[PDB]
Design a protein around this nucleic acid. Structure first.
Length: 198
DNA sequence: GCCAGGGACCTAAGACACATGTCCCTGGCT
């Protein structure tokens, strides 16, 4: 509907930077992130946002404590560079979320959610400590919401995420074209997990 | 005992691990 989110929430967008998404498909992914951010009350007192493109490493474009205006944050999200890497590592970006983004829980009153937008399957070698990163995030009360996009999304890892906590709800889409159709449902679900201000 | 696959966990409050260690299930190899 005409829904907007004004809760105590740290929302992290993790964008698959592999060639499983074309440059075109990746523009539609960024558009979805921008569309989502337009339904957020972005502020240090309300919804804080982070945006990372992940390949075999993590490229952070927005940090939670970046004191820039929302208009500028939505622009930075719009111009996230297409990588088209051979590998996108869900393990790598969850490790990055655990040890860098949520290194310190210095805003304990807010809910913490990582939207994991995945279109690929990492080499098994890289998945060694996948479950421990997901469990590590659970122990920081970080909700991991996997969004499977294309037919190469790691369904094994989506299921492994779902089982670790009841609030780790999976969204399994056929392509990026279905993202805009579920924006209201996804943003509504994220928001209802976050507490209202006193 | 060795190798290749699939899982469960400790090294958990910042790491550096795409790494060691323990346990369980398959399939090969004197």
């Amino acid at each position: 509907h005409d829904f907007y989110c004004s809760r105590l929430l740290d929302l992290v967008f993790l964008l698959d930077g592999s060639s499983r998404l074309s440059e075109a498909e990746f523009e539609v992914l960024k558009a979805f992130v921008v569309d989502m951010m337009e339904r957020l009350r972005i502020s240090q007192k309300w919804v804080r946002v982070a945006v990372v493109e992940y390949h075999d490493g993590s490229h952070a474009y927005i940090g939670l404590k970046d004191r820039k205006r929302p208009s500028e944050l939505r622009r930075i999200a719009s111009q996230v560079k297409y990588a088209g890497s051979q590998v996108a590592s869900t393990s790598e970006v969850l490790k990055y979320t655990l040890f860098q983004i949520f290194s310190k829980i210095d805003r304990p009153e807010a809910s913490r959610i990582a939207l994991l937008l995945m279109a690929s399957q990492e080499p098994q070698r890289m998945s060694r400590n996948f479950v421990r990163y997901v469990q590590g995030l659970k122990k920081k009360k970080v909700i991991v919401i996997p969004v499977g996009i294309g037919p190469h999304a790691n369904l094994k890892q989506i299921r492994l995420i779902e089982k670790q906590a009841p609030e780790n709800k999976a969204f399994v889409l056929s392509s990026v074209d279905e993202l805009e159709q579920q924006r209201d449902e996804i943003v509504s679900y994220l928001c209802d997990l976050a507490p209202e201000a006193p």
